[PDB]
């Protein structure tokens, strides 16, 4: 029971009681007492990163992988905290938590200029739900207790706790047996709100549900699918909702937006007369101009956060609610409406949506040498099972991936959709694998993304964390080249050079096979489209044999323009479209997944 | 003359008029208009980085390399700005400027949740002299004009300018012929202040001058040496003042502090009866407890910043002045005192200091296999010329390097002494080489530092920026291991693993030769101490031949405890000391440098 | 039912549903649309103060008198908000709420040195649970809805809502019949805790 211990020792009991089992971090002098308490306690597995930014993105991937997870990132004073800001921003922007813990200079030296001491509280405030330098040892467990309530409550977001060295080592009295986590705050919709929502949905003749990341955040994916099935309403996931209904479900109508979207998704949204928004916001990359997105449509919006409602457009009905509480009531009310014979039949509208999904395609089956990227994603759909979990960040790699890959369970698309920091992919994928060693993790990067934090592959080697990394290499910042076409230029976006150690990369610059191997991983390079599939097979075998990351690098043609535009009705198709399965053979309409 | 142009076009004329010729950066959609204006203008050479943090530390190295330089770092919106915070902190903490320029979302979308848009103004405020989102196109040249005044004036520090996309492209009328830079503010000491300072110096019987980074910041190194020569007063540089008097000068008395210090420097400081501080602050790693540092000593402190004076101790005489203005007057007053026969002879005190410098040494000449790090620095002193310019960051690598390497001109020790962010070394060294292609740049890293931003070597390959990187590899976070001895542990600090592609690294984990070669550079690995010198010779040859970075990796013994302690009189010597030149042959007392 | 109205008309329905019946204030040009909506709605009794600091402490006394009360303090842009800071500090310091509402310059002119315009959001942040300039008219009811949650939940404290003139007068669709106050967050001790204390 009650006993004298260091404040960091009480902190270990608190993290244990809050369900922490894993941490990613980089030790330093100012945070050694915490590491000492973590060693003495046991039962937190620590993974040492090779950049503090790598530890922070591993924590993000750990959070995102499984509902209720909270990744922990640990660092010393000074530059470790400033290296965590990009991750605090990324987690804040997507409404997910990580817990960052930094060492700090002793309290009495906070406003002197002590070595490697910085005002991390002020720097991190704009990108956290709480950022606090703890000023008393007895407050260390209470701040952690309040941190966990905030990471779980309302709109979730990250917390940074900054620990002065003397606060860490100071003795306190603490009783772990008496510690209890705080209740989680989550507002719930009333029946009056939900019956009104179902009333408007029954009155719409061509409705769609837009299912956002809040559905997954609430762990409500099964309820979302059940509600759509009862009402026979087609479902359009946002990028952050992707996976909350399987891609081969008859009601899954594609994705909508300016970039990570399908031609059939956009066409179905513009044909609809109602958008039933659950756990989405209405992001600019999803809507385009809001006047066009809402034209002729009733808009319902359910969000856990009151000030998200009305932020970018005025809904016809806005409801403050956790997505699981709201969907429980929506299923119950729809079941009552079904018993009463009041749910309209929707066979015609559903058939129109399925006809769009069958015909408005983009070509993937290219035999070109050098390889066209869209062929890579077709081969990934064939090579990996329906249980595949993809990890990606940003670039033409990621946009075409979202256009062409398919996903079948929630939290099998792991993507930092609002902030998009380059370098996220490798550490996030390691964090997913740490959360779930049985997860079939496959990452997608372009060459530039892959280079930012390439050193994290050695983390996978040192700790034997296996996954497959697909690397699509155009020796370009490809997304920025394509955006520069409006300025009639191609400037500071090329990565090619004659590699003095590798004439076999043919002027593409970095030799990613050699780099990955020096970092202790396995790697295969592919020049021809017919060699992609066997390469994925060797990679699975190499992964089982050595239990390290395996990189499959595909050498792309230098220049491919991915489909995108400024409005839902203005997306330009640069590459070939398709209206037949032979050109686009991995659409779920044509292919049985696993 | 006067003409209509985009605000970014006016920004190019302003940067030109302010002497900018180089930028380091990573383009993105939100900052494309600036890149378009930079392409159209010509005459700024852009170096594309492979991490935004790499661009920001390149800018720091460019600033530090040459007086009056200001490195420029360019990035897009969102995570690019958050990736610059560590560099803004590093530059702020050492009182040096960089100019960071980020793209931003259009003004009318700043408080919506636009894609990759973040409140970088609020995040960067604690670590900049100015951080401003520019809200009008006509203000773009005025903000840059005020930025340059602030980067040069008072205590220097960095500025971040955040540019909304619509502000960048908006047309304005601007006349480059009428643009003029603002005057620089620098307070100057009065003759009354300086005559009082010289009076106290003449009254001291055993004075030392402590010459800080402010002397170099003011470009006053030649005046500092001249003043010390006229007064015959021994000079103790801080780590940030190192190089402002040559290490082989008869008055250079060593360095003082808890870590980057000499046994003879500390012994000379504790024997002195006055510290004449010029352009230093009195940093905790330099002083230890201030009660012991000041015991029995008069303290003079000259600083350009009023609130630096008295911050950590109360000087007997504090003077607000730029170091060059103050040293001009100090030379003039000392010349008057010399003509008047009023400067005391100091042969005895100088002889005592030189006797300490001759006898209180640390051994470097180790024949051990595996190699002892101190032998590496002895070989670096022999291999490179007196014009060598070292670049380093932090770790046992850097601390022993500062204890054992020697430097002979100001701005030939390039070191982020207050913030110490891992990964700084490679990009800072590239920035020094970009500032001065004739500089003989040699970097020193440990393996962990080297891994953080290892991908930046490919920048050196793509652009042919040659320098030598000395990599001392213990497969450890060595400084953190040594600090963990107080907690009787060795925990989360090892980087070793059996590399499945390289049994020749013998369980040291990452194969840095293979990684460096895949990045397009050259690399040599050394296992035996007698092979270090030939390796430095091949590296010079490989560098001349291929004009890329050349890495020389020395395989160290896993565990070496560097000398350090908690007070000037409490530094523990773990490894062998020396009192004879055979054990420490590269001290300047024994070796003629070049 | 749902109807077109100004954002400030919707704010009156929200204040009504949240139980406000009284306000203490000093009008000015930048907060006139709010006063117009209060007058049209009726049923908030306004008491005119003879110093903005006096309205702000009237609001404190109104809160403290009766459990569940929330005093409301109204003022115009500029110095009216800076005159409310001492009350926001005093309410925060004692863990009690007041709701301060200030007028503000229109959004397009927020960083333009417009007459009597100040960054009250930044000034009031240290002494409030929330201090916010509302940047969309449709957000006015939602900001007020979150404010009442914050003033009642956890450790109570005050909120300042800052309303740009153009946000006040813009039209929105709002249904007073569908508005519902948010649930109040109040942690409870477990029986294991209370038995240990006894
Ligand atoms: C290059 C690139 C291109 C992209 N292209 C597109 C595109 O074409 N189309 C597209 O849609 N996206 C696209 N995205 C992603 C886009 O930027 C957004 O991240 C995404 O649209 C937001 O999804 P969402 O609306 O579900 O919001 P989320 O960020 O997932 O959040 C939605 C809401 O969930 C709420 N919430 C949180 N927890 C709960 C809970 N328990 N219950 C209820 N609500 C809760 C939050 O308050 C928030 O308002 C792209 C991203 C990138 C990097
Ligand atoms: C691992 C490690 C170990 C270290 N060990 C030591 C050690 O043992 N000893 C040691 O001394 N350092 C050590 N350092 C470096 C130390 O942390 C400080 O960076 C350094 O001591 C500060 O030097 P300084 O006093 O010259 O200050 P600076 O940071 O260089 O600044 C001094 C002053 O210059 C002023 N100034 C700026 N411009 C001008 C101008 N134009 N004119 C006049 N004044 C101006 C500023 O206002 C400031 O107050 C170590 C660093 C690391 C990373
Ligand atoms: C830190 C950071 N800097 C800049 C950007 C802007 N950005 C988005 S995509 C991109 C290029 C990515 O190139 P690569 O990963 O090679 O992918 P490709 O588009 O070529 O497939 C850049 C620079 C960003 N997202 N993050
Ligand atoms: C971003 C960041 N995280 C952590 C630290 C703390 N730190 C200082 S030195 C060090 C280990 C450096 O090891 P290496 O570069 O291998 O050098 P060695 O001490 O082994 O010679 C660490 C983690 C830091 N300075 N910066
Ligand atoms: C993409 O790499 C770059 C070059 O190489 C072609 C250049 O010549 C110039 C001027 C800029 C650049 O970024
Ligand atoms: C019969 O199964 C199929 C569907 O569901 C009806 C579809 O919607 C589409 C587009 C293809 C298909 O095979
Ligand atoms: C330094 O690498 C590490 C290990 O490997 C020896 C471990 O076993 C554990 C438990 C932590 C660790 O960081
Ligand atoms: C004669 O040159 C020399 C000195 O200067 C007098 C010294 O101070 C020392 C320590 C060695 C030396 O050779
Ligand atoms: Mg890196
Ligand atoms: Mg690319
Ligand atoms: Mg090391």
UniProtKB/Swiss-Prot annotation, chains A, B:
Subunit composition and interactions: Homotetramer.
Any single Gene Ontology cellular-component annotation: acetolactate synthase complex
Name it.
Answer: Glyoxylate carboligase
Which Gene3D superfamilies does the UniProt entry name for this protein? 3.40.50.970, TPP-binding domain
Q: Among its keywords, does the record have Nucleotidyltransferase?
A: no
State the function annotated in the UniProt record. Catalyzes the condensation of two molecules of glyoxylate to give 2-hydroxy-3-oxopropanoate (also termed tartronate semialdehyde).
Q: Which CDD domains match?
A: TPP_Gcl, TPP_PYR_POX_like
One Gene Ontology BP term is: glyoxylate catabolic process
Organism of this sequence: Escherichia coli (strain K12)
The gene for this chain is: gcl
């Amino acid at each position: 029971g009650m006993a004298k211990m260091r404040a960091v020792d009480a902190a270990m009991y608190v993290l244990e009681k809050e369900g922490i089992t894993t941490a990613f971090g980089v030790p330093g002098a100012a945070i050694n007492p915490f590491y000492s308490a973590m060693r003495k306690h046991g039962g937190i597995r620590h993974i040492l990163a090779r950049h503090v930014e790598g530890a922070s993105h591993m924590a993000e991937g750990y959070t995102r992988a499984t509902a209720g997870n909270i990744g922990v990132c640990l660092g010393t004073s000074g530059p470790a905290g400033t290296d965590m800001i990009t991750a605090l921003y990324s987690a804040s922007a997507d409404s997910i938590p990580i817990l960052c813990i930094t060492g700090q200079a002793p309290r009495a030296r906070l406003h002197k200029e002590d070595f490697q001491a910085v005002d991390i509280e002020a720097i991190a405030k704009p990108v956290s739900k709480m950022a606090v330098t703890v000023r008393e040892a007895a407050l260390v467990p209470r701040v952690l207790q309040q941190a966990f309530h905030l990471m779980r409550s309302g709109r979730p977001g990250p917390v940074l706790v900054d620990l002065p060295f003397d606060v860490q080592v100071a003795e306190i009295e603490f009783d772990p047996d008496m510690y209890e986590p705080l209740p989680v705050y989550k507002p719930a919709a009333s029946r009056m709100q939900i019956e009104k929502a179902v009333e408007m949905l029954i009155q719409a003749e061509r409705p769609v549900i837009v299912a956002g990341g809040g559905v997954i955040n609430a762990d409500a994916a099964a309820l979302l699918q059940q509600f759509a099935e009862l009402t026979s309403v087609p479902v359009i996931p946002t990028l952050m909702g992707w996976g909350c209904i399987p891609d081969d479900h008859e009601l899954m109508a594609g994705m909508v937006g300016l970039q990570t979207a399908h031609r059939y998704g956009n066409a179905t949204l513009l044909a609809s007369d109602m958008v039933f928004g659950i756990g989405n916001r209405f992001a600019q990359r999803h809507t385009g101009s809001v006047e066009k997105y809402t034209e002729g449509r009733k808009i319902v919006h359910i969000d856990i956060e009151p000030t998200q409602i009305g932020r970018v457009l005025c809904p016809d009905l806005g409801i403050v609610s956790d997505a699981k509480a709201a969907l429980t009531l929506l299923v119950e009310v729809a079941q009552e409406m079904q018993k009463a014979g009041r749910l309209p039949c929707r066979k015609e509208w559903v058939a129109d949506c399925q006809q769009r999904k069958r015909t408005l395609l983009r070509k993937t089956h290219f035999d070109n040498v050098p390889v066209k990227p869209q062929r890579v994603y077709e081969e990934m759909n064939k090579a990996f099972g329906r249980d595949v979990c993809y990890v990606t960040t940003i670039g033409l790699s990621q946009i075409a991936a979202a256009q062409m890959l398919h996903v079948f369970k929630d939290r099998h698309w792991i993507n930092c959709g609002q902030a998009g920091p380059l370098g996220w992919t490798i550490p996030a994928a390691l964090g997913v694998c740490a959360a779930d060693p049985k997860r079939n993790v496959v990452a997608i990067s372009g060459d530039f993304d892959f280079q930012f934090l390439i050193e994290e592959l050695a983390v996978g080697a040192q700790f034997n964390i296996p996954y497959i990394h697909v690397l699509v290499n155009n020796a370009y910042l490809g997304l920025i080249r394509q955006s520069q076409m409006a300025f009639d230029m191609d400037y500071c976006v090329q990565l090619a050079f004659e590699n003095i150690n590798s004439s076999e990369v043919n002027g593409y610059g970095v030799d990613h096979v050699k780099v990955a191997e020096g970092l202790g991983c396995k790697a295969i390079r592919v020049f021809k489209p017919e060699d992609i599939a066997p390469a994925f097979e060797q990679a699975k075998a190499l992964m089982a044999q050595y239990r390290v990351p395996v990189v499959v690098e595909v050498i792309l043609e230098r220049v491919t323009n991915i489909s995108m535009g400024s409005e839902l009705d203005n997306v330009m198709e640069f590459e070939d479209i398709a209206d037949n399965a032979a050109d686009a053979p991995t659409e779920t309409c044509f292919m049985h997944y696993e």
